[PDB]
Task: structure prediction
Amino acid sequence: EIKSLKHEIKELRKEKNDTLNNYDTLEEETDDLKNRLQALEK
Amino acid sequence: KRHITYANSDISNKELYINEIKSLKHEIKELRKEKNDTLNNYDTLEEETDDLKNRLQALEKE
Amino acid sequence: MEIKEVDDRAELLRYTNNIPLLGKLVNHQPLWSTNPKLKSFSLEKISAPDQRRVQEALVVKDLLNVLIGLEGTYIRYFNDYEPSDPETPIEFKIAKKMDPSFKTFSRRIVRYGKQYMILTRAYEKWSDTSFGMVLQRFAYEIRRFLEDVYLKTLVERLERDFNKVPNFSIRELEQIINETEVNKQMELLYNIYEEIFREIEERRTNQSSLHLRLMVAFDTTVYPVPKGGAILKIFQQKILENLGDRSSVMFLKKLLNNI
Result:
């Protein structure tokens, strides 16, 4: 059962990989809008 | 007298040999705390992009 | 410039029964790649062709930070990386939006950083005495190579240059790197570690008097990890394959004499 638990934990790690890839895309989106507004105010 | 064998033994030194395997589940719990932290940070980044997008719309309207 | 109100804390590791003899006992830094703190900034506002100099200066700062094995500001770790996981792979995404001057040449430096991290992890792992004495001696050798060739020259010289020399260039950075030739020795050590890992993986997957009057009998015994004879054979094969490069062969002679 320990191997199955480790496999489920690795599946959760991959799910977190997907959601944190979404996090990275949202981070570069924040970067885009930040630099946009900074260029408009500058 | 001519023979060929196979080994099924290895050396173990108690000072650094593993005593139990539950530390992998312990670091799994550590990774679970890490995952909760990552979810919280995703929430904070969503809040930040919402506020800064609102600022963008306000300055574009001004 | 901003604030994220994140609890930046560092603490000693509670569990110690399965950390190796030379692994660290402190918790990891608070994961900037996911935990934002005080800044989430980009260089698209200064991505104008004229502000390329400030952009590449910040890039120089970040590449100076990342070479020590800790990620920089505008670089985000790939999600496969898990600090509490000691076997997690080493990979990270860099923003391709900036000028190719940021991403093209930085691949070598980030590969150097990745191999530095994996070599530190290999030093920590090979502290186990069950891997034989030659491996933990090669561990001391790689520690000396890291803390007396890599850190003593590269980071110190680069910081002094970035602090004194006006407008230091990544071209001159690569030039002094290849003039110190630490990259060749690092690649040789990386290939050695790759061959060691290959042999370990093979040994882990493959689990299944007549004339001279000697009272000796054969005991064909193989262990899950290689030993001194295997390591010496590997080093001999490597030097035979890399015959010709004087620096490489003299470094290998020194390593064989030391181990």
